[PDB]
Amino acid sequence: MNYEIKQEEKRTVAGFHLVGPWEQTVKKGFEQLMMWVDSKNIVPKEWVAVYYDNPDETPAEKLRCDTVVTVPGYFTLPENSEGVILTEITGGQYAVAVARVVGDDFAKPWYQFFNSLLQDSAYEMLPKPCFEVYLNNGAEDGYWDIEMYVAVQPK
C-alpha cells in the first residue's frame, strides 16, 4: 500500500505499559487509559499504540506495548495518577500510511505496510518502535481509521 516519508518531532506520551500477548494487553491497556483520561479531564492530541517487538519472532510472554495518549511537551501529570507512565516517542523520519479497518483484522494493514516498505529503493527501516494513531472512535462509527508510523532512514 501507499505511504510517504515525514519528518516528525518527538512525542510526549502518557499512559500504560503492558507486557504479554497483545490479544489481551492492548484492549486492557486502552480501557485503563480511557478511565484515567476521563477521570483527569485530559484532552489528548492522539490515541496511540506503540509496539516494541515483532510478534512473529518474540515469544508472546515477552511482548511489550504502550497504550497512551499524546500530550503537549509541557504536560504536567495530574495528581493521583498511579501506574501511569510518562515518556517519549522519538522524532525523526517516519514512513506514514493510512488505512481503514472494517472488522477485527488490525494486523492486516501492518503486514501490508511492512511488505510495501520493504520494497523501497530509497529508505530502510530502523530498529525503533513503530506506532499507530487511532484517528476516530470505531466503537461508535463501526470502522477504525488508523495512521501507522514506521521509523526509517535513507539507504
Curated annotation (Swiss-Prot):
InterPro entries: AraC_E-bd, DNA_gyrase_inhibitor, DNA_gyrase_inhibitor_GyrI, GyrI-like, Reg_factor_effector_dom_sf. Keywords: Cytoplasm, Stress response. It holds the Pfam family GyrI-like. It comes from the Bacteria. Inhibits the supercoiling activity of DNA gyrase. Acts by inhibiting DNA gyrase at an early step, prior to (or at the step of) binding of DNA by the gyrase. It protects cells against toxins that target DNA gyrase, by inhibiting activity of these toxins and reducing the formation of lethal double-strand breaks in the cell. Protects cells against the natural plasmid-encoded toxins microcin B17 (MccB17) and CcdB, and synthetic quinolones. Can also protect cells against alkylating agents that act independently of DNA gyrase, suggesting a more general role in protecting cells against DNA damage. Belongs to the DNA gyrase inhibitor family. This is DNA gyrase inhibitor. It comes from Escherichia coli (strain K12).
